Write a protein that binds this ligand. Structure first.
Ligand SMILES: O=c1ccn([C@@H]2O[C@H](COP(=O)(O)O)[C@@H](O)[C@H]2O)c(=O)[nH]1
Ligand SMILES: O=c1ccn([C@@H]2O[C@H](COP(=O)(O)O)[C@@H](O)[C@H]2O)c(=O)[nH]1
Lengths: 219, 219
């Protein structure tokens, strides 16, 4: 499994290259894993991934929530891994063939697929939540070993862990800004994803240090 | 609603700038609306939208299938409209708050949201299909005016048309490569989306001219 320093993944969703690099540099002593998404990539280009690798060496998870047909999913994954991402996050809701397409490219390029099963925001309750256990089972059937579930609903996160087993790797967003607690989330997830609580902080380094301090006994 | 020339939208999913530009230029006399997605954008940058605008008299629909939490959706939409997209495609399955976020940005920035309700690929049957009527009804209640539904399932496309009413705008992918028929799809959809059937042809202009000839009585 992926070895995430301090069990803490930075969600770098600032949309200015100067700010994103500066803030990431400010917290670099605390993390070795950065989650980069569309806010940054669509503002500054996919070349930003190589820039992070050059400046920080961190591993890069592309949170692209891939959710297209199989043929197009393959193209998206290929473009993403070509840009230097170590892993990609894929939606499970569009079905098995769409996930398999991503697994195919990941296998070909030696990278990892993370399956997003239940999302962390309130609207996740409308359609995703009722499908989520089945989506996780589908992941297991497909041989998926990396998963994403919601910090905002620890009971749902726990169920996700139950389904996938202790051997699978599980990361969890919704910590801080969305209301999730770092320590409680780490009862079930291998690592927490944290964005705004760090990158909007007046002092991001102190923010990251504070989070890590709060979970010291879990490290 | 947008006035799509020949009821035909080009899905430009080539991943090389030179190829994408060549093919789009070759079919420009038949099409004034181009759908750009992540295969091209992640390969060549969001600057490709401006370049298409510069080279062609074409409106741009960004098929980004936005599927994040509300706050991140806002950022994605902002980045996409800043780059010059006329419209963005958003997934409905993450729920009402996620869709509303996109609508709010679209209203502020004077652009349009298209709601993707049911997808065209076989895997869409697993989770999306069972939610699709309610996703559509949600769209209607949110005041969504533009929709995307599957050419590959005429019965489902027909039901979607019913739900959204005759005044709503409906575009439909899955024509050609995925098995959908141009004429039958236009019984319900205002415009068809066609990718590979055009852009992989020895003569894209002839392929587009051929599709249009086959629906001539519908124009
Ligand atoms: O169910 C999910 C899946 C992914 N994210 C992503 O995780 C990060 C959360 O950031 P923040 O809430 O800590 O700022 C954002 O990049 C967001 O897109 C979620 O918040 N919830
Ligand atoms: O349910 C959907 C929604 C969007 N698309 C998009 O429409 C285009 C279809 O291309 P093609 O099958 O005509 O090549 C691609 O960009 C694809 O991502 C679908 O195929 N199905």
């Amino acid at each position: 499994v992926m070895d995430v320093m301090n069990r803490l993944i930075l969600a770098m969703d600032l949309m200015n290259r100067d700010d994103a690099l500066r803030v990431t540099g400010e917290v670099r002593e605390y993390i070795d894993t950065v989650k980069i998404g569309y806010p940054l990539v669509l503002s500054e280009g996919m070349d930003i991934i190589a820039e992070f690798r050059k400046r920080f060496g961190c591993r890069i998870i592309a949170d692209f929530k891939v959710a297209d047909i199989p043929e197009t999913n393959e193209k998206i994954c290929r473009a993403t891994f070509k840009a230097g991402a170590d892993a990609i996050i894929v939606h499970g809701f569009p079905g098995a063939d769409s996930v398999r397409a991503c697994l195919n490219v990941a296998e070909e390029m030696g990278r990892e697929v993370f399956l997003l099963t239940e999302m962390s925001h309130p609207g996740a309750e409308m359609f995703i939540q009722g499908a989520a256990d089945e989506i996780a089972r589908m992941g297991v059937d497909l041989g998926v070993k990396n998963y994403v579930g919601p910090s905002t609903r620890p009971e749902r996160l726990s169920r996700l862990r139950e389904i996938i087993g202790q051997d699978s790797f599980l990361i969890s967003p919704g910590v801080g800004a969305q209301g999730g607690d770092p320590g409680e989330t780490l009862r079930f997830a291998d690592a927490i994803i944290v964005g705004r609580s760090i990158y909007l902080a007046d002092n991001p380094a102190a923010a990251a240090a504070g989070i890590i301090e709060s979970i010291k006994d879990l490290l």
